[PDB]
């Protein structure tokens, strides 16, 4: 939703575009759009659901 995805080699994080403040990928800080096939450069990864433990 804001910022870009980054990876330190193993994990994946989303951080603001002007300061390295990584955090876990969550459905709140991202938004779904369409299917995986259309976009190029997409990578496999899981998105944590905040209400999943609930």
């Amino acid at each position: 939703r804001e910022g870009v995805f980054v990876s330190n080699g193993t994990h994946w994080f989303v951080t603001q575009r002007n300061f390295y403040e990584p955090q876990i990928i969550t459905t709140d800080n991202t938004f779904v759009s369409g299917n995986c096939d259309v976009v190029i450069g997409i990578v496999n990864n899981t998105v944590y659901d905040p209400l999943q433990p609930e």
């Binding site: 870009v4 575009r17 938004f31 759009s33 369409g34 259309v38 976009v39 190029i40 450069g41």
Partner: protein, 50 residues
């Protein structure tokens, strides 16, 4: 200077214009052709019109 993939940079400009990033990635091929075609057209217009 901060390196960044050019299609990703477009998403920044698209996001900074009022459209979501997805509209670019879902149309990256179309936009690229339009950009190249426009770049070709301006060259001809400059060459033709004195």
């Amino acid at each position: 200077a901060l390196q960044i993939p050019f299609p990703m940079q477009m998403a920044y400009r698209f996001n900074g214009i009022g459209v979501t990033q997805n509209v670019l990635y879902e149309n990256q091929k179309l936009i690229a052709n339009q950009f190249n075609s426009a770049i070709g057209k301006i060259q001809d217009s400059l060459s033709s019109t004195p």
